[PDB]
Design a protein around this ligand. Sequence first.
Ligand SMILES: Cc1cc2nc3c(=O)[nH]c(=O)nc-3n(C[C@H](O)[C@H](O)[C@H](O)COP(=O)(O)O)c2cc1C
Length: 147
Amino acid sequence: PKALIVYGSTTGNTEYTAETIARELADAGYEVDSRDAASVEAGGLFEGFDLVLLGCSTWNDDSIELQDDFIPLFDSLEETGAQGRKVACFGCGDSSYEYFCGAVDAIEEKLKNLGAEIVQDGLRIDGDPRAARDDIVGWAHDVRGAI
Ligand SMILES: Cc1cc2nc3c(=O)[nH]c(=O)nc-3n(C[C@H](O)[C@H](O)[C@H](O)COP(=O)(O)O)c2cc1C
């Protein structure tokens, strides 16, 4: 199976998360394509992928709390080929904030509205993902199993 991992990361937490997930998948036998949201084009992004994992950090704001690099993707999610696609979301945040990993909720909700198949509840990481290594690995483990 082929998996696409797209992440929006500002300080590198979600990026570390994405790489950890990517390794787990790889070791399981998937061909994984991991990409920074800043370098992708939305049109047909998901074509040909068996699994798509989208991740992004959350930023407190009155309009849009998504990580800046992920915004363009999010705004054109309807052109990615999400209908009937098996997907799962992840993101880093901080429980000291009102909307803890609110970006995860937003992405899941929009994917659900576009007809994607959410395979598992999103991975919401509080603080340093290097300290949540087990959680990431375990979650990656569960999404493979839901596929
Ligand atoms: C100014 C600021 C605002 C933040 N706002 C939120 C927030 O609304 N919700 C959340 O869960 N985390 C929030 N966080 C924490 C970031 O989402 C958290 O640091 C995350 O690890 C960053 O991930 P990244 O390196 O992949 O971008 C904020 C952090 C900063 C510095």
